[PDB]
Amino acid sequence: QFNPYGDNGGTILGIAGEDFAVLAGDTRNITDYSINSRYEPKVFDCGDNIVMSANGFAADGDALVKRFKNSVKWYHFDHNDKKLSINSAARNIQHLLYGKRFFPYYVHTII
Amino acid sequence: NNYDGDTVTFSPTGRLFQVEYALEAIKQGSVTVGLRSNTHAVLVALKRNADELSSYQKKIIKCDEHMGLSLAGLAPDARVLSNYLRQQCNYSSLVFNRKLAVERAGHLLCDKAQKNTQSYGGRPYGVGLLIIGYDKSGAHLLEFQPSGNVTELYGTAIGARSQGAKTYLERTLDTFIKIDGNPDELIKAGVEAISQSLRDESLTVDNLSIAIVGKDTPFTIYDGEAVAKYI
Amino acid sequence: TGYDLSNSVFSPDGRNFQVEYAVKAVENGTTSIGIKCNDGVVFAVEKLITSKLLVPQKNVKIQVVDRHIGCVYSGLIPDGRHLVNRGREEAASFKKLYKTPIPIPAFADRLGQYVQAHTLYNSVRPFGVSTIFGGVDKNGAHLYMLEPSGSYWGYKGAATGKGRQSAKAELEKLVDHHPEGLSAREAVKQAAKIIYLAHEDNKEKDFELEISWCSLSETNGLHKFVKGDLLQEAIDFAQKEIN
Amino acid sequence: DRGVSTFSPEGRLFQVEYSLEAIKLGSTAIGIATKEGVVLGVEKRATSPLLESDSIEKIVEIDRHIGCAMSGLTADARSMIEHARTAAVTHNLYYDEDINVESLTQSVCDLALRFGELMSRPFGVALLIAGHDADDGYQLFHAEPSGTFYRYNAKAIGSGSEGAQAELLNEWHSSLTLKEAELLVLKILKQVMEEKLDENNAQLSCITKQDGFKIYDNEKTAELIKELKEKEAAE
Amino acid sequence: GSRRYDSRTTIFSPEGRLYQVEYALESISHAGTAIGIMASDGIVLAAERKVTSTLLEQDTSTEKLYKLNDKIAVAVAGLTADAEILINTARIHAQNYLKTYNEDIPVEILVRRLSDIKQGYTQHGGLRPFGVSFIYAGYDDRYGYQLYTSNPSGNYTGWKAISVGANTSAAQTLLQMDYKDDMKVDDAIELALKTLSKTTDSSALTYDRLEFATIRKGANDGEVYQKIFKPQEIKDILVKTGIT
Amino acid sequence: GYDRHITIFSPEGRLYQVEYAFKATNQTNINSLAVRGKDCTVVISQKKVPDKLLDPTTVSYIFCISRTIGMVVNGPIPDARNAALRAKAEAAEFRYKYGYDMPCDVLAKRMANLSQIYTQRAYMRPLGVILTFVSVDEELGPSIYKTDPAGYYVGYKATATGPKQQEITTNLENHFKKSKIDHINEESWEKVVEFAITHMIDALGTEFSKNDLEVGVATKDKFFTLSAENIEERLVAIAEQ
Amino acid sequence: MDIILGIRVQDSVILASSKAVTRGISVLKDSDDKTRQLSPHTLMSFAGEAGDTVQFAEYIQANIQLYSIREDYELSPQAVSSFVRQELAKSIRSRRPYQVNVLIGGYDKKKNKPELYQIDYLGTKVELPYGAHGYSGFYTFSLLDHHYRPDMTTEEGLDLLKLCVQELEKRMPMDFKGVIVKIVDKDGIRQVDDF
Amino acid sequence: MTDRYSFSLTTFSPSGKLGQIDYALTAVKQGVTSLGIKATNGVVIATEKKSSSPLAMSETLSKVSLLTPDIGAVYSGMGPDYRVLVDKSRKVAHTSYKRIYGEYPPTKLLVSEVAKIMQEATQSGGVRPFGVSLLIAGHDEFNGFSLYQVDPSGSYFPWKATAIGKGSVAAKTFLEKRWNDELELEDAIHIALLTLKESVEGEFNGDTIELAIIGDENPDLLGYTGIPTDKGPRFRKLTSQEINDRLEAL
Amino acid sequence: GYDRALSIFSPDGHIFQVEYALEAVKRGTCAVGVKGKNCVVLGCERRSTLKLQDTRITPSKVSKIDSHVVLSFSGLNADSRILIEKARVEAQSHRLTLEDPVTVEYLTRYVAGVQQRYTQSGGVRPFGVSTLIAGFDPRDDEPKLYQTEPSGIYSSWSAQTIGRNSKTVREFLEKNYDRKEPPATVEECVKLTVRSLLEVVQTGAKNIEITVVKPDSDIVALSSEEINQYVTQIEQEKQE
Incomplete structure (x- = not known):
């Protein structure tokens, strides 16, 4: 039977300072006991000073990031180029994820 | 006369009167100008207020990082059409990782307008649009009319008294076509063009609207104090 | 009466007046033609230069369908595009189910039935274009012309728009003077000539010439636009003859 | 007859133009914007004295930071208010923030041209929408059934409107205080109103960043009426 | 498009007023008269047929009077075929009620749903109204014997005695004159036929031009019987009161 | 009104739209005629190509509906082609559902409905066409069934359609009045075609070249149209006569 | 949910219904009223699947209350019981069937008779002198078979119920936290407060 | 595209006539005469076969149609409208009756279903009324023989004998004289032939006359044997030859 | 679906179908509502050109929407049944989700919204009906009376009338209703209500219905006599 999920490995981590934040992730991409790539980035600049990574099943990760980047783009179009605050991004991403509650994106997301 | 009750009726000489009446709402619209070199494309538009207590109606709309337009006529129709363009530019990027050619954007608008001119119940769009963009074949300007006719041009203008700027641009043609690598000069030439269309009114700081796109310039809109420079 | 106020109503003479009014819109358009040759077809159209501000070469009017068919039309341009979009869908669906690219007569009937369908109901308006189109299939070259009524036939040569009589007269001449055939190259040049001649009946504004062709030997059965030297050569030939 | 979405030979939509005529028959409503707040006031116009005038509801909360007044066929406005409230609350659900006044206004205006042969006719009511947001501060918008909305420093709609607007042209400046603006709204309402303005046949409201949108009780408005008389007599 | 041909019904x-409703009422006023009269011990329905030819099959017939369930019948004035559409609807509605509650449908409830259907055709859908007025005769264990009428507007009202179709003016004036509350079924029979006899546009009232029915408690104890009179039974009832 | x-x-x-x-x-100003042999059914129609620029081979009012059925149309070509496309679709669907070839009369009833x-x-507007269907039916033999915009249809011994239709009709009645039979008592379709052209010439009072006609023949198991050269060969035989 | 019983005596129907609401290893509530008044002389008790029970009971209540206002009349117990059966019979072939069993106890004023209907989740209806849903019946049916008489008083009926509850508190494995008891007679519906 | 005609095309005028029904009845008046007569042991329905050209083969156009093995129909008015009504009538006899009960519907009921179809064309969106009046003759176990008329409005009436079309007034009078309740089927056939001669101006033989009966069961017309309870259709169309036999003794 | 925009704007800005719906209301029998200190009364004309009526079964002019709220109306009777049903359904649905019966203002807003909806939807005409809706909010004793009309506007009234000759009875009520002093009792309120109808009705015979609504779902209709006592009683206090 077709399994619509896979596992691409890797790992990520975020730390926040007083006036900065970092989002780190390795660049290895795997399936089973093989390496697909030693350099495939999985942490992204999304605009408005928001960095994002969705790590686990990479096809799901990429779809989410793509949808969120596109969300930022339409936020600008719809609310007079207003900056998307990080708290607002967070809530937006909850709705992106929960919209697939019964067929989930297999990712741990950090922004 | 007997043949203007809706878009789906031809007159005995082959005219579509509802489409012609849509064209007429454009003519009452405040004037807007477009023009372009080989490196940049500029839109200049004269805005219009209800009275001294009101804002000036926006006439310029961004469609993507590399494309946008100005409007004359029914502004809600511009919001519909510009929004359709935003989607088309967006679909091109998400699916193909490809910035939408300005020529294709032209064709999509033509076909969208056309559908409203052949079925019962609809009405034509009542707005004219000037699309500028910079793509893989350089700078472009397009004139959209709600008959469905779209036209690629070096420069043009639509709205009331747009004939003034249109002749001027026809005169200026060999000069402004070669304003390459110099943004503020192309804008000035566009601002001059639009001035050939004024009456009892002159360009002020909350009156004038400018946009530019080009070789190393995302589509960006200038208003208020940012146009003082050119008045 | 009032028999002319609504599409698909028969008048007492048995006519559909709205289609007849669509034709007036076609008659008011620029001149476009098609010439059938030895192993192919040639299409040409008069593009009026409204203003110097039109970018030359950059408002293309001839359209390709699939890889082997050209289409040109006079009248309401947007209607012409609508018809071609439909043509493209019809060709895709034929090639998807049957693999082979759509034959030209088959394609002509697809456009015919679709155009005819817009004369069946009061809730649509008939097409305001006549369309000249054709190409090369497994059986040779075919040229067609299609009217707002949905009427179409195969042609030796065809013309529509403002200069239709002048172009028709010129076309009859060639058919008489070359009864054994016309090469794709004779035809490209003759097409240039006829558009220049037909521009008489529309001579206020001056115009830009646009040509295309499919030829088994010259384009390998594919539709191509005529540009550069071949285009200039055909303009030169035409300029020769109006002088 | 002929279709509901038809253009006139002058390039205007018959049905939209005619709805504008119905709005001119409506009761008056005025709003003024200041840097201390926006005031909205209306003429209640009870058709008969047996009618309990506080039940006349022509000023309405959309969200804490946005209020609305209306004029024309006011029953048409129920579904516009409902849509506005939902757009505002929905925006806050999706984005954990307040929705901008302009964006709210644009959303209401998107409904406007959703008619034809989607509703059966345009709305027969204009709205004044007033609120505050962190990006553009205090704001007043006029939302018409054409789908167009303008920002105003001050504006009148309804039967008294060309009168009141000429007046607002004279009296408005960029330094009015909230108190100055309240009195002005009363002053000009009394000018254009048929019957004699009091705290039962006209009503006030404002929106301030600090306390949000408030409709004034009749007691509070009564004193402002008294205070206006005293200012006027005194020169 | 098609707007051009829409009557706006x-x-x-x-x-x-509602044009189409008024014009349907005008149509009905030229149909055979039907009369309903309510007694303390039963109900009468009588109706005059539209001018018979001598060659019409009179016994295997039905045109005016229809059974809805075992406790309810109607008399029809107007377009017959329109009436059959509504009758089958009403028959089905009665059966859903019986299926759902295991009790026969109360008369009003059935009357209301038929009238609600009629009303709908006057407010939405752009179709012509049904050209029918009904007299409903029935019995239920809450109100006993009941008469109602309904017409193309979907309006309905209850009566002690009433007429529909042609000459209701004359007919109503006569019923008003001789009707009385203590009256019995057999008196009401006589009254129904006397009234039709005087209002008819024919030269004389005969068995072949009539339909007739009763709803009585005239079976055994606490139960109700519908009798749709055969031609012979009408021929008798017409002598037994000497109209022939 | x-x-x-x-x-x-x-x-x-009355239904005026049907009448119109x-x-x-008759817009096309063409006449057609159909007759039955012993073995075959023949249909001929005038062919007029006034424009020199037309490709005469694409100018036709006769259609091969199925392998066994032909149809000739009187009326404008766009409506004619609409009817032909539908009839082809109906004939092929019938074969797939019921496992045998649609009879001429059944297709006629269907198009009439x-x-x-x-x-x-x-x-829906009526189509401005009259449809004559022909075949050699495996049960009924040579068959002619004709449809009009009223949805009327009936089978014929022979028939004619067009502006000069009454002249051809009477000509044909007069022949059968004389021969005392339902059909052309002829073995070869070549001679039935010749009969058809001859009695059209007489009734219309005009002579024909090979490009003034268009001919379709139905035999057992095929309907086919004739080429200009086939028609010539047939015109020649009429002359030497 | 779990325990619901009903006895019909000379002049009334009595419903008894357990008070416990248990989920997992926790009794969440000991005062739960597993009943809805459908009309002033009709009561309905219910047991079964969490959520489904109350939702269904309240949905029926709303419908009968609607019928009452529309006709200014009160449906007979038999009529209400048939309406309820049909609803349950529809449910059984749904995408998700209501898993709810009910007893309906009413006093029919047209006939002056009390009536008890037992309807399970499948839409299986019977009128009975006494009824029980679930494991209850395995004890109470035989007990009542022995001790019940058709002409008993409301007070005799209540003692008969006391016997039933006593047996269930002795032999059932779960603590159902007692019962709430309700009487349906010619004067309506009242709650016995000390049981 | 699509039907924007969702509103009624038949409506009430101020006088209360339904115009389109009146006008359909007018089309029926212009139509060729047809009639039906009911006997004690049969029904006969008949009409004239007025030809279009003499090149037309009038056998291929049957005006008298079998609906069920015991029910037949003839009409006056618009022939194409009749043809499609016959198609629908045959089908509804199956879908709404035979497929449910395993036996063909009784005459009044099949008539009822046709009347419904015609009533709907009188009130639904975007259609016109049928331009025909039908005469339907049939037999069924519990009602015996019956004859009905169905009109454009959807109204139907049972008759002893009647006529419709062109010469209906005269023919109805001719039938009132000659009808009695003891007519045996052979006599009813003879009266029908007489009545039709009045209204036919041209040739009058079995090739211009179409006539069918509803009589005894015809086991020879069944096509099979071996089921005792299946006894054959009661509907029979008289042949051309059989009509001319009766026309000599006329 | 039949689609036509029947309610549309005229050049002067009127919606003629909504205005013609009011004409249908103008033609309906009169109805009036008067609210007291502690009650509300609803009275309704019934046209007496109809003897032989059976009033046991003929639909009453006041309708219970829930057990604490009532609705009366003037205009098309068949239209009013549609509004009454929808209101009753909403009443039960409100109880089901909110666990509280409707406030009178809520029920009014609902009915009014339904009426407005039918003035800007394709294929429907407006309701030829105006309503009076009266009662007491749950656990509240302040009386309530509201009016709706075909356009969908609604409002609160100390007392109000609608239907034919409502202009005459509004006249009466306008000078006889002391805002400062509502009919302090049931009996007083029933009287003022009957007086206002006798201005317009003719004989107080079968020509008047009255319904009284007191707090906590206490609703009763009077019979001939009890009304008739006011008819006689007022008429004698009259000769002056």
């Missing part, structure tokens, strides 16, 4: 006149 | 613009009744019980569709039938619908339903 569901609009108001400037006087606030 | 809007009872003139759509297919509702006029006060005298009949007038559109479709036309009936356009006379009753308002949003």
Whole structure:
């Protein structure tokens, strides 16, 4: 039977300072006991000073990031180029994820 | 006369009167100008207020990082059409990782307008649009009319008294076509063009609207104090 | 009466007046033609230069369908595009189910039935274009012309728009003077000539010439636009003859 | 007859133009914007004295930071208010923030041209929408059934409107205080109103960043009426 | 498009009337008269047929009177075929009620749903109204014997005695004159036929031009019987009161 | 009167749109005729190509509906082709559902029913065409069945359609009045075609070259149309006579 | 849910219904009223699947209350019981069937008779002198078979119920936290407060 | 595209007539005469076969149609409308009756279903009324023989004998004289032939006359044997030859 | 679906179908509502050109929407049944989700919204009906009376009338209703209500219905006599 999920490995981590934040992730991409790539980035600049990574099943990760980047783009179009605050991004991403509650994106997301 | 009750009726000489009446709402619209070199494309538009207590109606709309337009006529129709363009530019990027050619954007608008001119119940769009963009074949300007006719041009203008700027641009043609690598000069030439269309009114700081796109310039809109420079 | 106020109503003479009014819109358009040759077809159209501000070469009017068919039309341009979009869908669906690219007569009937369908109901308006189109299939070259009524036939040569009589007269001449055939190259040049001649009946504004062709030997059965030297050569030939 | 979405030979939509005529028959409503707040006031116009005038509801909360007044066929406005409230609350659900006044206004205006042969006719009511947001501060918008909305420093709609607007042209400046603006709204309402303005046949409201949108009780408005008389007599 | 040919069947006149309803009422006023009379011990329905030819099959017939369930019948004035559409609807409605509650449908409830259907055709859908008025005769264990009428507007009202179709003016005036509350079924029979006899547009009232029915408690104890009179039974009832 | 613009009744019980569709039938100014042999059914129609620029091989009012059925149309070509496409689709569907070839008369009834619908339903206009269907049916033999915009149809011994239709009709009645039979008592379809052209020449009072006609023949198991050269060969035989 | 019983005596129907609401290893509530008044002389008790029970009971209540206002009349117990059966019979072939069993106890004023209907989740209806849903019946049916008489008083009926509850508190494995008891007679519906 | 005609095309005028029904009845008046007569042991329905050209083969156009093995129909008015009504009538006899009960519907009921179809064309959106009046003759176990008329409005009436079309007034009078309740089927056939001669101006033989009966069961017309309870259709169309036999003794 | 925009704007800005709906209301029998200190009364004309009526079964002019709220109306009777049903359904649905019966203002807003909806939807005409809706909010004793009309506007009234000759009875009520002093009792309120109808009705015979609504779902209709006592009683206090 077709399994619509896979596992691409890797790992990520975020730390926040007083006036900065970092989002780190390795660049290895795997399936089973093989390496697909030693350099495939999985942490992204999304605009408005928001960095994002969705790590686990990479096809799901990429779809989410793509949808969120596109969300930022339409936020600008719809609310007079207003900056998307990080708290607002967070809530937006909850709705992106929960919209697939019964067929989930297999990712741990950090922004 | 007997043949203007809706878009789906031809007159005995082959005219579509509802489409012609849509064209007429454009003519009452405040004037807007477009023009372009080989490196940049500029839109200049004269805005219009209800009275001294009101804002000036926006006439310029961004469609993507590399494309946008100005409007004359029914502004809600511009919001519909510009929004359709935003989607088309967006679909091109998400699916193909490809910035939408300005020529294709032209064709999509033509076909969208056309559908409203052949079925019962609809009405034509009542707005004219000037699309500028910079793509893989350089700078472009397009004139959209709600008959469905779209036209690629070096420069043009639509709205009331747009004939003034249109002749001027026809005169200026060999000069402004070669304003390459110099943004503020192309804008000035566009601002001059639009001035050939004024009456009892002159360009002020909350009156004038400018946009530019080009070789190393995302589509960006200038208003208020940012146009003082050119008045 | 009032028999002319609504599409698909028969008048007492048995006519559909709205289609007849669509034709007036076609008659008011620029001149476009098609010439059938030895192993192919040639299409040409008069593009009026409204203003110097039109970018030359950059408002293309001839359209390709699939890889082997050209289409040109006079009248309401947007209607012409609508018809071609439909043509493209019809060709895709034929090639998807049957693999082979759509034959030209088959394609002509697809456009015919679709155009005819817009004369069946009061809730649509008939097409305001006549369309000249054709190409090369497994059986040779075919040229067609299609009217707002949905009427179409195969042609030796065809013309529509403002200069239709002048172009028709010129076309009859060639058919008489070359009864054994016309090469794709004779035809490209003759097409240039006829558009220049037909521009008489529309001579206020001056115009830009646009040509295309499919030829088994010259384009390998594919539709191509005529540009550069071949285009200039055909303009030169035409300029020769109006002088 | 002929279709509901038809253009006139002058390039205007018959049905939209005619709805504008119905709005001119409506009761008056005025709003003024200041840097201390926006005031909205209306003429209640009870058709008969047996009618309990506080039940006349022509000023309405959309969200804490946005209020609305209306004029024309006011029953048409129920579904516009409902849509506005939902757009505002929905925006806050999706984005954990307040929705901008302009964006709210644009959303209401998107409904406007959703008619034809989607509703059966345009709305027969204009709205004044007033609120505050962190990006553009205090704001007043006029939302018409054409789908167009303008920002105003001050504006009148309804039967008294060309009168009141000429007046607002004279009296408005960029330094009015909230108190100055309240009195002005009363002053000009009394000018254009048929019957004699009091705290039962006209009503006030404002929106301030600090306390949000408030409709004034009749007691509070009564004193402002008294205070206006005293200012006027005194020169 | 097609707007050109739309009559607008569901609009108001400037006087606030519904054109199509009024014109349907006009249509009905030329149909055979039907009379319903309510007694303390039963109900009568009588109706005059539209001018018979001598060659019409009179016994295997039905045109005016229809059974809805075992406790309810109707008399029809107007377009017959329109009436059959509504009758089958009503028959089905009665059966859903019986299926759902295991109790026969109360008369009003059935009457209301038929009238609600009629009303709908006057407010939405752009179709012509049904050209029918009904007299409903029935019995239920809450109100006993009941008469109602309904017409193309979907309006309904209850009566002690009533007429529909042609000459209701004359007919109503006569019923008003001789009707009385203590009256019995057999008196009401006589009254029904006397009234039709005087209002008819024919030269004389005969068995072949009539339909007739009763709803009585005239079976055994606490139960109800519908009798749709055969031609012979009408021929008798017409002598037994000497109209022939 | 809007009872003139759509297919509702006029006060005298008439459908004007149907009547006007009949007038559109003659727009093309062509006549057709059909006759039955012993073995075959022949249909001929005039062919007029006034424009020198036309490709004469694409100018046709005769259609191969199925392998066994042919149809000739009187009326404008766009409506004619609409009817032909539908008939082809109906004939092929019938074969797939029921496992045998649609008979001529059954296809005629079917196309007649479709036309009936356009006379009753308002949003659909009638087609301005008369359809003559021909075959050699495996049960009924040589067959001619004809449809009009009223949705009327019937089978014929022979028939004619067009502006000069009454002249051809009487000519044909007069022949059968004389021969005392239902058909052309002839073995070869070549001679039945010759009969057909001859009695059309007489009735119309005109002579024909090979490009003034168009001919279709139905035999057992095929309907086919003739080329200009086949028609010539046939015209030649009529001359040497 | 779990325990619901009903006895019909000379002049009334009595419903008894357990008070416990248990989920997992926790009794969440000991005062739960597993009943809805459908009309002033009709009561309905219910047991079964969490959520489904109350939702269904309240949905029926709303419908009968609607019928009452529309006709200014009160449906007979038999009529209400048939309406309820049909609803349950529809449910059984749904995408998700209501898993709810009910007893309906009413006093029919037209006939002056009390009536008890037992309807399970499948839409299986019977009128009975006494009824029980679930494991209850395995004890109470035989007990009542022995001790019940058709002409008993409301007070005799209540003692008969006391016997039933006593048996269930002795032999059932779960603590159902007692019962709430309700009487349906010619004067309506009242709650016995000390049981 | 699509039907924007969702509103009625038949409506009430101020006088209360339904115009389109009146006009359909007018089309029926213009139509060729047809009639039906009911006997004690049969029904006969008949009409004239007025030809279009003499090249037309009038056998291929049957005006008298079998609906069920015991029910037949003839009409006056618009022939194409009749043809499609016969198609629908045959089908509805199956879908709404035979497929449910395993036996053909009784005459009044099949008539009822046709009347419904015609009533709907009188009120639904975007259609016109049928321009025909039908005469339907049939037999069924519990009602015996019956004859009905169905009109454009959807109204139907049972008759002893009647006529419709062109010469209906005269023919109805001719039938009132000659009808009695003891007519045996052979006599009813003879009266029908007489009545039709009045209204036919041209040739009058079995090739211009179409006539069918509803009589005894015809086991020879069944096509099979071996089921005792299946006894054959009661509907029979008289042949051309059989009509001319009766026309000599006329 | 039949689609036509029947309610549309005229050049002067009127919606003629909504205005013609009011004409249908103008033609309906009169109805009036008067609210007291502690009650509300609803009275309704019934046209007496109809003897032989059976009033046991003929639909009453006041309708219970829930057990604490009532609705009366003037205009098309068949239209009013549609509004009454929808209101009753909403009443039960409100109880089901909110666990509280409707406030009178809520029920009014609902009915009014339904009426407005039918003035901007394709294929429907407006309701030829105006309503009076009266009662007491749950656990509240302040009386309530509201009016709706075909356009969908609604409002609160100390007392109000609608239907034919409502202009005459509004006249009466306008000078006889002391805002400062509502009919302090049931009996007083029933009287003022009957007086206002006798201005317009003719004989107080079968020509008047009255319904009284007191707090906590206490609703009763009077019979001939009890009304008739006011008819006689007022008429004698009259000769002056």
